[model samples]
Target: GSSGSSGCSPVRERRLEHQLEPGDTLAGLALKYGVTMEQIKRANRLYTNDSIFLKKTLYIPILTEPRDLFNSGPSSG
Candidate 1:
């Protein structure tokens, strides 16, 4: 619940830190976050099949709504 100038949303919204766990893969993380694999990769600056190691932290963009569209730029269009 954040806004600016009413009806406005943050451009690059919130992201959470998640340390990789055993059996954790980028594909699996995408499903767990309900976001596309590309979203995960792009957000984390990761490549397809780039090694995601155990205990490594990743910034998980929280996308439960329009948050899905947030990217690395200003929120205003």
Candidate 2:
């Protein structure tokens, strides 16, 4: 189950894919997907300071965190 406190998806669709784009940051993806920064970073094996490459396939883990509308900005590892 998703680790969110509430409004979470228990049986989420597996492996949501996102291709990195120009002007994109780790923070951008996290904010857009309603996921915590760590969820995207850990799933994609990205370090906190590591810059995401453009056009790369990022399999965002939807099941890691639940629908956290109150989630904040990006954070370091």
Candidate 3:
């Protein structure tokens, strides 16, 4: 039986506001923020039209930082 149990690090959801630029789109925005377009859509209330206007601030919810397997702890192969 295991006596000690360590709790994993907690991941907190965060938010970021971005202004709509000339080349900004839901897909690209999500990709840049490591989130899904659906998250952006819901945050910005774009469910009906799915359209964003220039100079408008879009609410972006950041779930977590992107994980990179190759950049892990020291491991010599």
- The numbered model that scores best in TM-score is 1
Better of 1 and 2 by lDDT: 1
When summed lDDT is taken over every stretch of 10 residues in candidate 3, the lowest stretch is 48-57
Per-residue CA lDDT of model 3 for 1-77, tens digit only, reads 87898766755777777777877777898898788888777766677643566336777786755576666544567
The CA-based lDDT of model 1 is what? 0.71
Each prediction's TM-score versus the true structure = 0.56, 0.52, 0.55
Go through the candidates in order and give the clash count of each. Answer: 1, 0, 0
The top-ranked prediction according to lDDT is 3
Query: Which residues of candidate 1, in runs, are more than 4 Å off?
Result: 1-12, 48-50, 66-77
Superior candidate under lDDT, 2 versus 3: 3
Residue pairs whose backbone atoms clash in candidate 1: 11-75
Ranking by lDDT: 3, 1, 2
- lDDT, candidate 2, at 6: 57
Q: How accurate is candidate 3 locally (lDDT)?
A: 0.72
What is the clash count of model 1? 1
